[PDB]
Amino acid sequence: MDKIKQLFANNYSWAQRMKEENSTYFKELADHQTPHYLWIGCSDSRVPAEKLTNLEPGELFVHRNVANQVIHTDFNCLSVVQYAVDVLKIEHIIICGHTNCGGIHAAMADKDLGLINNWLLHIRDIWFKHGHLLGKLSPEKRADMLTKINVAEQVYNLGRTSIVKSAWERGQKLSLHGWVYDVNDGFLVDQGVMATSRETLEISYRNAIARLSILDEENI
Amino acid sequence: MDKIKQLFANNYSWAQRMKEENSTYFKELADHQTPHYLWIGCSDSRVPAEKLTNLEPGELFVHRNVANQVIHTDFNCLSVVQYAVDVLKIEHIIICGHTNCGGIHAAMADKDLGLINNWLLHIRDIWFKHGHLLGKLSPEKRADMLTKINVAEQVYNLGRTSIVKSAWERGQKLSLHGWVYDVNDGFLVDQGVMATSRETLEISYRNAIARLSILDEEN
Amino acid sequence: MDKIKQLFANNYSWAQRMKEENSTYFKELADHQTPHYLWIGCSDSRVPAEKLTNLEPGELFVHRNVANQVIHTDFNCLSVVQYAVDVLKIEHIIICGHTNCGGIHAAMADKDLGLINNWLLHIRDIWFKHGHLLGKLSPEKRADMLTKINVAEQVYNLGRTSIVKSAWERGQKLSLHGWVYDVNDGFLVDQGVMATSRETLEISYRNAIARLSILDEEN
Amino acid sequence: MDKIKQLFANNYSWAQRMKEENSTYFKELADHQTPHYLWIGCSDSRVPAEKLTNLEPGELFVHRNVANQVIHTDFNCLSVVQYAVDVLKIEHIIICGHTNCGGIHAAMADKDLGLINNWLLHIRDIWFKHGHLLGKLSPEKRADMLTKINVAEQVYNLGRTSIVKSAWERGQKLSLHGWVYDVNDGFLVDQGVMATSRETLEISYRNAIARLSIL
Ligand SMILES: [Zn+2]
Ligand SMILES: [Zn+2]
Ligand SMILES: [Zn+2]
Ligand SMILES: [Zn+2]
C-alpha cells in the first residue's frame, strides 16, 4: 500500500540520518539494557509515554490494551507485570489513562461492536459500580469521570494481584501509580491511588474514591 | 520516590514550555482522531514506534506484550485487533520484533522465571518447530534468528484469526506486516510475510520461512 | 500408582461388564450425537450433572471451572458458549452452583493461595458489591448466600456476552438459567435470573437480586 | 420451555426418591470432601468420567473445554490445575480424550465457525506438527489419530507448566496421564505419556510419539 511505502521511507530517512550523523542514540539505548518503570497505557496512545516522561531511551517497559485495564484474569497483562517485577526487578508500575478515550466511550455506548464489548464489560461493571455518583454528573462530564475512576480501579486491581502482593510480602521494593493526562494539556495528573504495600493500597484507594465523589458545582 | 518525582518533574516542564510556546502539538494531535495503523510490538520497547515510523501524532493504535505475540486465544490482543479492524477500520497491522530481545532470551533460557514462562512456551514451541534450522545455527546467533522467525509466525497467527479472515471475506481492505529492526541501527527490515488476503498470507508465509531457512556460513 | 491403578481396574471391570451384559448404553449414547443443553458447573463436581438431571447420555455439553464462573474475557468458557450456541444450536444454557463450594470458601478466605486467587478476585468483587446485604447476614450463612448471588451474577455475565446477545438479535431461540443445589439433598433451586432475551435478562436479574435481599429474621 | 420443566421434574423425582427412600448418597458424598484426581476432559462429555471410572462420589475435581485442551496461556485451565495441585494437593492429573470428538472434527473442517475457530487453532498447530504421519491417512482415520495425538500433546503442555514443574521441584508427588476411550465401548486406553517428573515427561512423550507413528 501507499502509506506503508512512505512509512518505510520515513524510517530509512531517520535511520540513515543517524548513521551518518554518528549519533549516539543507539549507544545510549544500549547502555540502558534494563528498564526501571513499567508503563500500562491505552492503545489509543494519544501522547506517547516517552514524550510525557522525557525519559532516556530503554528506560520504559510498556504494555497497552484498550482502556488501559488490568483484568484479574488477563494472562497477557499479568505476564508483563510478573516479568517486570520478578525478572527485571523494576520498582515502579505506572497505569496511565487519558481523556477522550475511545475505549471509555465505546464502553458507555449502547452498541454491539463485536468481541471488544466483552473486554469492555469490565469497564461497564465499574460504571454501574459508581452509578449513583456518575449519575449526579453532567452528560459531557461522565466520560472523563469514568476515565479517572477507571484508572483508580485498575491500580486497585493491580495491587490485588498475587504477583504484586507476593512481591511486597518478600520485602521487595515496588510502588503502583495511577495518573491521567488531558489530550490538550499533556500534564500527568495523579488520581490518588499510590501503593507501596497492601495497607497503603487500601488506604489511598478508599480516599481516592472518596475525593472523586466530591463533585464541583460544574456538574449538575 | 526519587525516580517518580523526577519523572513528574520532566513532565510539568515539557508540558509547560509547550503551553507557553503556543505549540500546536495538542492541536494537531487532535486533528488525527482515528489511527490508521495498528502496531503490535514488544514490551521491551527499545526504539519507540513513533521514532521508527516518524509518523504523525495519534496515527498509531498500539499493543505491546512480551515478545510481541499474537496468541490464538489471547483475549487482550485479539480485542485490540478486533476493535482496530471492525470499529476503527484500520487497514494496516504491523507486528514488529527487535534484536537482543529479553522475551526471546528468556524463552531460550532453561531457568523457570515464573508465570512469564507459560506465556513464553509459545515461543519455545516456535523454536522446536524450527529446531533443525536453529540447531544448525551458531549459539550466539540463534536468539536473533528465533527473533525473526517469531515475527513470521505471529503474522501467520494474526492472519489465521477469525477476526482478520472475516474482515477480508466481507470485503474490507486490510494488510498484515511483520518486520524486525536491529537495536543497534534502527532499520526496519521486512521478514517476508505480508498479507492482504488469506491466499497471500499462505504464499508469503511459505516463502518467508523458506528464505529464513537459508543459512550463510557466518551462521 | 494405587489410586490410578484402581481407577483403571474399575474401568476395565465396568466396560467388560457392559460388553458381557450385552449392554445397549453405547448404542443409545450414539443416538444422542448432538447435546440440547450446555451445563456450566463447578470443578468440585459434588453431584454430577447427569445424576441431578437423569438426562439421557450425551444430551449434555459440559464446562467446569472453579466456582462456575462466566468471566467477561475468559476465552475458554466463551469458546464453549459460542460453539454450543452458534454451532450446536443449543437452546438451553444452565449455570449451576452448589452449597459448600471450595471456590466460594476460598474467595471469602483471606489466605493468598497463589494463581487461583486472581481467578477468585472476580468472586470477591461480587462479595463487596453485595457487602451490605451479606454483612447484614449471619456469618455461617454468608457462604450459602454468596454461592446463590454468584450464580445470579454469572447468568447476568453470560446474558451480556456479545455471543448470547447476537443470537437473540438474529432471532435464535436461547434461554439462560441459574440454579443451585444443597450438597445434602440434591434439589435444584432456581435462583431467579432466567432470560430468553436481554429484556428478560435485566428484569429477572433485578428481581433476583431484590428477592435475595429480602431476609427473614434468622440471618 | 418444556425441556426444562421435564429436567426439573426429573431432579425432584430423583431427589425426593433419595430422601424418603432414605439414601446415604449425600452422607457418603460428604465423607469424600477432597478429590484425589483432577480430570480434564472434553465438553462433549460423551461417557461421564464418573461412569468410566466408577469411582466414589466426590473423588473427582473436573475441568472440561472443547477438545480437552491445556493451552499454555489459558487462565481458566491453569487455575484449575494450580488450585488442585497447590491447594487440594491432588497427586494425579488425567487428560482424557475420546473418539468421534466434535472438537477434533471442527478443527479439521475448513469451515469458519466463529470464535471457536481461534480456540481450535492450537489443535491445527498440533496437526501440522505431526503432518507427516497424519498426511498418510484418509480424513476419517486422521481424526482418530489426531484425537490420540492431541491427548499426548496436552499432557506434554501440562507437564511443561510452571505450576506442575514447581510442584515437582519442591518434591511434591504428582503424576500426569493421557488416555482416550472409544465412545462405542468405553475402554480407557493409555496413550503412552505418563509423567512424575520433567525427565519422565520428556522420555515418555518421545517414546509415545514414536509408537503412535508406527502404522
Ligand atoms: Zn484510550
Ligand atoms: Zn523484546
Ligand atoms: Zn464448587
Ligand atoms: Zn470431544
Residue C135 neighbours by CB under 8 Å, 6+ apart: none
Q: How was this structure determined?
A: X-ray
Deposited resolution, Å: 2.2
Buried b (16+ CB within 10 A) or exposed e, D151-176: bbbbbbbbbbbbbbbbbbeeeeebbb
Residues of chain A positioned with their CB less than 8 A from the CB of D115: 115
**Catalytic residue at B42?**
yes
Active site residue C96: no
What is the DSSP track for D170-210?
A: TT---EEEEEEE-TTT--EEEEEEEESSHHHHHHHHHHHHH
Q: What residues of C are in contact with residue A121 (Cβ under 8 Å)?
A: 72-73, 157, 160
Cβ–Cβ pairs < 8 A, chains A and B: 213
Q: How far is A85 from chain D (nearest CA, A)?
A: 17
Question: By the CB < 8 Å criterion, does D115 face chain A?
Answer: yes
Quote the CA–CA distance of B41 and B63 in Å, as a whole number. 7
> Cβ of B74 and C74 within 8 Å?
no
Closest among D187, D195, D207 to D94, alpha carbons compared: D195
Q: What is B134-164 written as a DSSP string?
A: HHHS-HHHHHHHHHHHHHHHHHHHHHTSHHH
| D155 CA to centre of own chain | 9
Residues of C in contact with D12 (CB under 8 A): 187
How far apart CA B202 and CA B160 sit, in angstroms, is: 10
The ligand with the least distance to the CA atom of C42 is 3
Q: Which stretches does DSSP call E strand in chain D?
A: 37-42, 60-65, 92-98, 175-181, 188-195
Nearest alpha carbon to residue C184 among C110, C112, C121, C98: C98
Of B94, B87, B55, B78, nearest to B172 (Cα)? B87
CA–CA dist D99, A110 (Å, integer): 44
Q: Do B118 and D157 touch (CB under 8 A)?
A: no
User: How many other β-carbons are positioned within 10 Å of the β-carbon of residue A210?
Assistant: 10
Residue A30 is inside which H or E element, if any? helix A25-31
C-alpha cell at C7: 481407577
**Chains within contact range of chain C (3+ C-beta pairs < 8 Å):** A, B, D
The grid coordinates of residue A159 equal: 495491587
Residue C188 contacts D, CB cutoff 8 Å: yes
Q: Which residues of A10-48 are buried (b: 16+ CB within 10 A; e: fewer)?
A: ebeebbeebeeeeeeebeebeeeeebbbbbbbbbbbbbb
Whether A101 has a binding-site annotation, put simply, is yes
Candidate from A1, A29, A183 with C-beta closest to B26 = A183
The angle formed by the CA atoms of residues B79, B80 and B83, to the nearest 5 degrees, is 80
CA–centroid distance, residue B102 to ligand 3 (Å)? 40
Among D3, D44, D53, beta carbon nearest to C36: D3
Joined grid coordinates for residue B97: 520484533
- The answer to whether the beta carbons of residues A80 and B43 sit under 8 Å apart is yes
Q: Could you tell me if residue C190 is left (phi over 0), alpha (psi between -120 and 50 degrees) or otherwise beta?
A: beta
CATH code, C101: 3.40.1050.10
Specify the number of domains making up chain D: 1
Nearest bound ligand to the CA of residue D97:
4
Q: What residues pair up with B24 in beta bridges, in sequence order? A: none
Residue C86: Cβ-neighbour burial (10 angstroms; 0-12, 13-18, 19+): middle
C140, exposed or middle or buried, with CB in 10 Å at 0-12, 13-18, 19+?
A: exposed
Shortest distance between the Cα of A46 and any Cα of chain B, in A, equals: 5
**Chain D interface test: which of C83, C113, C179 (most D C-beta within 10 Å):** C83
Determine whether the interchain pair C161/A112 forms a contact, defined as Cβ–Cβ distance below 8 Å. Answer: no
Residue C64 CA to ligand 4 centre (angstroms): 14
**Residues of chain C with C-beta less than 8 angstroms from the C-beta of B73:** 75-76, 79
For residue B73, give the nearest of D74, D114, D165 by CB distance: D74
What is the end-to-end Cα distance of chain A in Å, rounded? 49
Q: Which residues of A touch C165 (CB under 8 A)?
A: 112
Quote the domain boundaries for residue C163.
1-219
CA distance B150 to C143: 47
Q: Cβ–Cβ of C162/A112 closer than 8 Å?
A: yes
Q: For residues A192 and A109, what is the distance between their CA atoms, to the nearest angstrom?
A: 27
Q: Which of residues 74-93 of D touch B (CB under 8 A)?
A: 74, 78
Query: Measured between alpha carbons, how far is residue A128 from residues A149, C6, C162, C165 in Å?
Result: 12, 52, 18, 19
3-state secondary structure C81-146: HHHHHHHCCCCEEEEEEECCCHHHHHHHCCCCCCHHHHHHHHHHHHHHHCHHHHHCCCHHHHHHHH
Q: Which ligand is nearest to the CA of B33?
A: 1
Q: Is A62 exposed, middle or buried (0-12, 13-18, 19+ CB in 10 A)?
A: buried
Max alpha carbon distance in chain D (Å)? 61
